[PDB]
Amino acid sequence: MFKVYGYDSNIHKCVYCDNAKRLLTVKKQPFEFINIMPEKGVFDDEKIAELLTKLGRDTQIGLTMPQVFAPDGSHIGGFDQLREYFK
Numbered sequence: 302m303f304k305v306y307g308y309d310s311n312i313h314k315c316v317y318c319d320n321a322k323r324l325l326t327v328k329k330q331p332f333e334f335i336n337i338m339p340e341k342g343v344f345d346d347e348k349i350a351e352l353l354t355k356l357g358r359d360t361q362i363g364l365t366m367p368q369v370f371a372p373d374g375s376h377i378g379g380f381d382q383l384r385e386y387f388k
Contacts, residue, residue, distance in 0.1 A: 303332035303377070306352060307367025313338050317367050317380035324380070328387050337366065 303325055308315045318334075325332045337352070338344050352368075353361065356376060369377045369386075377386045 302372040303330065303383070304370035304372070305332065305334050305367045306337055306348070306370065307334070308338055309334050309336050310338075312336075312341055315367060321367060321369070321380045321383065324384065324387065330387070332369075332372070 305318065305321060307313075307318055309318065313336075322332075335348060336345065337348055355370065356364075365379065368379060369383045371377055377383045
């Protein structure tokens with residue numbers, strides 16, 4: 302189950318979510334979504350905090366969404382970056 306760090310609602314846009322979703326489904330792999338903005342304009346301090354630590358030990362260099370994560374490993378990347386993970 303891949304973890305997608307992005308937005309799944311009317312509180313935020315998301316293009317890669319549409320393709321990335323069918324992407325994993327097409328390859329025949331399960332996954333789970335995660336919204337980093339559970340409010341009309343407020344990110345999730347809980348996930349955001351763990352997100353940074355999950356990334357590494359630096360800062361968010363223009364961190365964009367959606368950001369996927371290994372179902373049981375480490376950060377994989379976005380859509381295209383992940384497509385490489387799926388080959």
